[PDB]
Design a binder for this molecule. Structure first.
Ligand SMILES: [Mg+2]
Ligand SMILES: [Mg+2]
Ligand SMILES: [Mg+2]
Ligand SMILES: [Mg+2]
Ligand SMILES: [Mg+2]
Ligand SMILES: [Mg+2]
Ligand SMILES: [Mg+2]
Ligand SMILES: [Mg+2]
Ligand SMILES: [Mg+2]
Ligand SMILES: [Mg+2]
Ligand SMILES: [Mg+2]
Ligand SMILES: [Mg+2]
Ligand SMILES: [Mg+2]
Lengths: 195, 175, 139, 175
RNA sequence: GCUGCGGGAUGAACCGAACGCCGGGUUAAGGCGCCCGAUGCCGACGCUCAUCAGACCCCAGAAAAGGUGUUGGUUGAUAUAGACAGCAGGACGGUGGCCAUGGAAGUCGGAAUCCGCUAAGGAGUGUGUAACAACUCACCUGCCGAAUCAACUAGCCCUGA
């Protein structure tokens, strides 16, 4: 059904390729933590290309024409727009199925986030090559919401710690229960047939 | 040539036609690296037409045979001589390759020349292939592979492009 | 950090390739990518396989440099790699994956009913232990 | 008998070739178009058996960019005669399908049966012309694995040329 | 022109291939990250970091020249009879040689060109004085310690743009 994807440590084009392929099949995919999506190359080059993209505008009326979003979620949504056939009611329905968010929403705090191995910085890039941060680029050009998103991100990280301590306590309790006795009769079946 | 896949070594002997002006041709012999025997025969005609007064019509090929490796299970050192034609002018070259077999070493020679010097199979003319032993290698790469009790780990070994599921909770580590 | 490394005389697993699930042993490194591997008793023939094609393990052997198949077999039988390799958890992991591949429907039914019974007993004991933890922490 | 004495040996150059046409129809010079008309290659992917000769080789050297010609094996002849054996009486090509058709039309020369036909096509005897004129030009399908670039010769890793044993692999892909 | 079809995004001439209506299989030209069918092969080798990267005949952009940015290659020259770098010291006598006068006393300038001490001095590589003077270099020696230097050549990238 829903595919909640991490954005921490992913690449823009690779993640956009996998999302734009999997959204045409019907799986409702949502890319969360979009401010952490890395872009290869130099950061001066990335902001120079984005400055050229801002320079591209209609001269007779800039409103009727090129729109230039500054938020990184809308940057990734434009990246998936430029790959889906959005002028037809296949890519238009796919962009209606696609949802993108900066930070993490409260349902996606609770729901588990997936990590795509094919789009990772470590898998795809040589570790001695330069990179950038899409949230850093967005804060440098236009998107003035880094200080609020980072504060709410630290808040949900504190929430995640105070949940993970309870989860690890319950895991220690259930492994004490597994350490206890009189469960091995089924384990004679299970260890033979793939414990 | 194409040098498609791995290469193969062919011993090709060829002579002129028996003429009443001069019988018993000298029956020359070459060592042609080629993907198959037809390309070996054609490249043999090319080299012997370069060297002596020979062509395909006034001559013949007596025998064209596969040359198997004398010791495939030994990691050996091969010096390759090159007569490659660059963009401005042609140049001679001596290269060294540490590999198992002669055909594999000449295969790596073609691939490495096409990698670095942008040389096609049109321009590369293998002059000579000779196995050299240790303490004669001119190159620092083969000289630093000359190490007994050699040690190296494999840092940052990433693999399995989408053999794992495309959507997982994992965050894959290296080494 | 860097506990393992390629070596003259180290056994190594093979994950990808035509000899998957078969241990080889590195004899010497050819050039940066491929190593002449050999198998004395693991049904694999002496050849050259890539490092990304193989998988490094922890056990080492006392091979001389470029020794014979005979000396490889003698060092293998001196080091006793087969019984000591069966007596580890990693081969148990590979064996469990093979047994899951070799399951059948009746075996899955038995695993599911044992799974239900074990999870009911585990749930009751976790409930009892957290009740006892609350009863201990209440004074 | 020669390697025991330490001497080399060359076999006879074969007198029977198989010619498949590779290139198309439009954009073809008349100098090669007339040779294709005489070799009965009016469409694409049709093949004939050619009695090799100096005149025939000097025909094929004109149309080397347009054909692939080689030395067919015994089963390369046999599968083409069995599976796609079409003859002609005067007009109206008919599949062979019976020895009575060959005995009625072609069997004036003691060649009444299909064993005789395969023998006369493979071993080029004194009545090869009647058998080659009786056989319709073999319509063949496109190969399974594909072709290599169709423009350069087989020496250059291509298709349009001579390959001398690989036409057996080509006919196992196509037939 | 008189000509559809598949690629070159789009196209009169390009590359395949020529057309009655359809089913199945296969292929050329081309391609397999998404549009957009196909590499989602646990593909192989090596090169490239480009503050204007680069991306396929016609085809829609670029040269002469330059780079101690990296990768090969050729010709050479040094080095335990302790080299290249670094730190320190010496760097004279004949002779302020000779043509020159406003001056040259190695240092604007023309022709030359040897010896002694030698650990080594070039009738002197440069800075500076109008010249006289000081500094530095060729060369030598003190410490360190084993590999180092020069000129060409062509692949990517950069400047030229
Ligand atoms: Mg054409
Ligand atoms: Mg197929
Ligand atoms: Mg093709
Ligand atoms: Mg043509
Ligand atoms: Mg008109
Ligand atoms: Mg016409
Ligand atoms: Mg078209
Ligand atoms: Mg175009
Ligand atoms: Mg069809
Ligand atoms: Mg696809
Ligand atoms: Mg134009
Ligand atoms: Mg250069
Ligand atoms: Mg440029």
């Amino acid at each position: 059904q829903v595919l909640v994807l991490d954005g921490r440590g992913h690449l823009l084009g690779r993640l956009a390729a996998i999302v734009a392929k999997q959204v045409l099949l019907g799986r409702k995919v949502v890319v969360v933590r979009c401010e952490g999506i890395n872009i290869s190359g130099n950061f001066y080059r990335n902001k120079l290309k984005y400055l050229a993209f801002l320079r591209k505008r209609m001269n007779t009326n800039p409103s009727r024409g090129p729109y230039h979003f500054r938020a990184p979620s809308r940057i990734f949504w434009r990246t998936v727009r430029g790959m889906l056939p959005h002028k037809t009611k296949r890519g238009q329905a796919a962009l209606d199925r696609l949802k993108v968010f900066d930070g993490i929403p409260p349902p996606y705090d609770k729901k588990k986030r997936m990590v795509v191995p094919a789009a990772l910085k470590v898998v795809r890039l040589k570790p001695t090559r330069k990179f950038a941060y899409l949230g850093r680029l967005a804060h440098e050009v236009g998107w003035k919401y880094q200080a609020v998103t980072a504060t709410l991100e630290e808040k949900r990280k504190e929430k995640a710690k105070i949940h993970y301590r309870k989860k690890k306590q319950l895991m220690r309790l259930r492994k004490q229960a597994e350490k206890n006795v009189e469960k091995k009769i089924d384990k004679y079946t299970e260890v033979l047939k793939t414990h | 040539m194409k040098a498609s896949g791995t290469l193969r070594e062919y011993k090709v002997v060829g002579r002129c036609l028996p003429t009443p002006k001069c019988h018993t041709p000298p029956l020359y012999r070459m060592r042609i690296f080629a993907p198959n025997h037809v390309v070996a025969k054609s490249r043999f005609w090319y080299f012997v037409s370069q060297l002596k007064k020979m062509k395909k019509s006034s001559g013949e090929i007596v025998y064209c045979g596969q040359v198997f490796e004398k010791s495939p299970l030994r990691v050996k050192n091969f010096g390759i001589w090159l007569r490659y034609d660059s963009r401005s002018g042609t140049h001679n070259m001596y290269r060294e390759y540490r590999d198992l077999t002669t055909a594999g070493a000449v295969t790596q020679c073609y691939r490495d020349m096409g990698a670095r010097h942008r040389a096609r199979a049109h321009s590369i003319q293998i002059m000579k292939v000779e196995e050299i032993a240790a303490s004669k290698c001119r190159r620092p790469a083969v000289k630093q592979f000359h190490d007994s009790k050699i040690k190296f780990p494999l840092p940052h070994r990433v693999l399995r492009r989408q053999h794992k599921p495309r959507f997982t909770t994992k965050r894959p580590n290296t080494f | 950090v860097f506990r393992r490394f390629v070596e003259v005389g180290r056994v190594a697993y093979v994950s990808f390739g035509p000899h998957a699930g078969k241990l080889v042993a590195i004899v010497d490194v050819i050039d940066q990518n491929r190593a002449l591997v050999d198998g004395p008793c693991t049904q694999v023939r002496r050849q050259a396989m890539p490092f990304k094609c193989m998988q490094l393990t922890d056990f080492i052997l006392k091979f001389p440099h470029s020794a014979h198949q005979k000396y490889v077999r003698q060092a293998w039988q001196k080091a006793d790699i087969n019984t000591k390799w069966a007596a580890t958890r990693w081969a148990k992991k590979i064996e469990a994956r093979e047994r899951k591949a070799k399951m059948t429907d009746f075996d899955r039914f038995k695993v599911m009913k044992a799974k239900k019974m074990r999870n009911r007993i585990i749930k009751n004991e976790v409930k009892k232990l957290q009740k006892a933890a609350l009863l201990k922490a209440s004074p | 008998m020669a390697r025991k004495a330490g001497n080399f040996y060359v076999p006879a150059e074969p007198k029977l070739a198989f010619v498949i046409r590779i290139r198309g129809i439009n954009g073809v010079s008349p100098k090669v178009r007339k040779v294709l008309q005489l070799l009965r290659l009016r469409q694409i992917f049709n093949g004939t058996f050619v009695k090799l000769n100096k005149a025939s080789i000097n025909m094929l050297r004109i149309v080397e960019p347009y054909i692939a010609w080689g030395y067919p094996n015994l089963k390369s002849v046999n599968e083409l005669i069995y599976k796609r054996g079409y003859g002609k009486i005067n007009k109206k090509r008919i599949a062979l399908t019976d020895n009575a058709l060959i005995a009625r039309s072609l069997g004036k020369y003691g060649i009444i049966c299909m064993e005789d036909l395969i023998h006369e096509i493979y071993t080029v005897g004194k009545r090869f012309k009647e058998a080659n004129n009786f056989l319709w030009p073999f319509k063949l399908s496109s190969p399974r694995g594909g072709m290599k670039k169709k423009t350069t010769h087989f020496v250059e890793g291509g298709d349009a040329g001579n390959r001398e044993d690989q036409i057996n692999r080509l006919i196992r892909r196509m037939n």
